[PDB]
Symmetry: none
Subunit: 356 residues, 2 copies
């Protein structure tokens, strides 16, 4: 399926003839998926009234015909695309100028010298930021898959395994539960590595006593989950327990004020204020969260710098973190949907430390 | 080093945002994170990032690490270019969005920009020993996982199940990830040069082409081997023999100075003489490195003499529509008097 219909409605309202997506090496993967249903890394998509064209190479010709109801052409795509643009008398073309390189844009500009280009990045971003109930359903499914897999994987964790072996098991188990991919490189940060906010599962061997931050998420029907929980090999120290309690309380304070109209800045501020008055401000994470959907990193940004009022049905994460350099770190993350007078938490896993 | 080798341009600017310029960030600084604004000049090696990566960046690079603790990173960057009196800036304009270029243009105001994409690609095309070691490791992980996976293949499994098992095994064997989605094409689907893993069930007698590759420390492997549940037919054995002999003909003459055009031609000619010219692939190989597809292209169109230490694949194939296909792929490093084959897996059909 695809949402090309609402896109057509969008450009037609402004008299724009067509929308061009240039997905090369996944440069516009999410847009390609959202507007055509194609999940591949290469796709040149042209959408206009009564026109749905998708140009891709031999690696994806069959796939594109399976995933979309577009007219698929196999192919250097500029000359091929221009033929259609001219045959359909398309004069104005909308583009996502944040998703086209300067060099490619100059190539397109030179080839289409008699055309007018219109950046619609803001409109497309707003379109994707507010999820339909169908999308929220898919995100929830991805979360359900992720959580079931986590529960089956967590007790199998033990000293001697490498962080990558743990990540491997979790990812394969998500596939067992229905995941059709992984949303991002699973993070399994053990011991001192747990103090690194966003590293990745490494060859480091997990040791007894290790605090382990696990950030994971499956994809299902193209939508993503993003969950973070903490595991401890053996009973955690009182200090670890205390930092964990502060993180949990900070998260809950942000969740209590989340409602339509709130800004990412305000949400971030309540967690930030709570943590710093406890004396841990210098160890607080960079931002409180981010949006999710077709991607693990999309709007809205739940940070100190985002003062934009958030409308209902945006989907984002709430994940305060406290990292003590050279010692350990703690981060707990929920996925939520903003609603008119509060929010809807989609994650359900216990937030307590999983002691194994 | 690379930054020095790259060094009337005053500085080179890499703007890695949400991994938008990850390859270059990794190549020039060693940093593996998603956010890094790098400035390189004769007297400056600066990496700007935020608290998500400060400690990591200091562990991974010898660059001065600057953390943006407030405002927009563009303002810090602007402050830096002005303090350093940088007037002409080099960019990989294939790796900077139109919108981002507008933002820096307005911020720097007067600066002149020059694209150096071709020069950077030329640098990455010739690998140093450290890179080859990483590629070798990605290959070793890939091969160990392959041997463990083939012994678990069961008639009745789908191509996707085999692909998933192989990827899981690579991950547990140390892979950072996969270079590309594992391809498992069985039976008539093996005759599809680009046929991807599907729900098709693998049966006894099916030719199973498996194209896979793990990534290790950001470098990629790209291997293709053939598996068969039970002894393969005499025809499959014959076609496989021809593909292998064609591959050997190309590998035999591969050395610094040779052209991809000749390598492709010798493999193609052999296949044609054997009566399969109409079923030959389109290209003989492609380069590998921080990405699965990079220079040099081992095709009829590339007549440029290949220098020592380029790293590429040699993968001839014969595809018989409706029947089966055979492809065997090696990863090699070009040397002065020959080539170093990095892939060690036997090229014979793996009968399980
Ligand atoms: Cl409230
Ligand atoms: Cl603060
Ligand atoms: Cl509602
Ligand atoms: Cl310019
Ligand atoms: Na289960
Ligand atoms: Na509330
Ligand atoms: Na360092
Ligand atoms: Zn996260």
């Amino acid at each position: 399926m695809d949402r090309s219909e609402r896109l057509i409605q969008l450009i037609s309202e402004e008299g724009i003839d067509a929308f061009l997506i240039m997905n090369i090496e996944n440069s516009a993967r999410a847009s390609s998926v959202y507007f055509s249903g194609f999940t591949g890394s290469f796709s040149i998509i042209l959408i206009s009234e009564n026109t749905r064209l998708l140009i891709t190479d031999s690696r994806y010709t069959v796939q594109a015909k399976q995933e979309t109801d577009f007219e698929v052409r196999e192919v250097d795509f500029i000359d091929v695309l221009k033929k259609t643009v001219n045959d359909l008398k398309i004069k104005t073309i909308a583009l996502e100028e944040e998703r086209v390189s300067l060099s490619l844009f100059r190539r397109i500009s030179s080839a289409f010298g008699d055309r007018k280009f219109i950046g619609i990045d803001d409109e497309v971003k707003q379109m994707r930021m507010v999820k339909d109930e169908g999308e929220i359903e898919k995100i929830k499914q991805a979360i359900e898959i992720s959580e079931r897999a986590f529960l089956e994987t967590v007790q199998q964790i033990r000293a001697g395994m490498t962080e990558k072996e743990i990540a491997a098991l979790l990812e394969y188990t998500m596939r067992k539960e229905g995941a059709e991919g992984v949303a991002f490189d699973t993070i399994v940060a053990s011991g001192c590595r747990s103090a690194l906010p966003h590293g990745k599962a490494s060859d480091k061997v997990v040791e007894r006593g290790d605090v382990i931050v696990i950030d994971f998420g499956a994809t299902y029907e193209n939508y993503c989950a993003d969950i973070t929980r903490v595991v401890s090999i053996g009973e955690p120290s009182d200090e670890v327990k205390e930092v964990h309690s502060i993180v949990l309380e900070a998260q809950e304070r942000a969740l209590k004020i989340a409602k339509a109209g709130v800004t990412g800045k305000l949400l971030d501020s309540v967690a930030r204020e709570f943590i710093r008055e406890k004396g841990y401000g210098e160890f607080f994470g960079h931002s409180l969260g981010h949006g999710i959907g077709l991607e693990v990193h999309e709007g809205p940004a739940i940070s100190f710098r985002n003062d934009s009022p958030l409308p209902e049905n945006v989907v984002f994460t709430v994940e305060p973190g406290i990292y003590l350099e050279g010692k350990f770190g703690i981060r707990i993350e929920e996925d939520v949907v903003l609603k008119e007078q509060g929010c809807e938490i989609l994650t359900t896993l216990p937030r307590s430390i999983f002691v194994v």
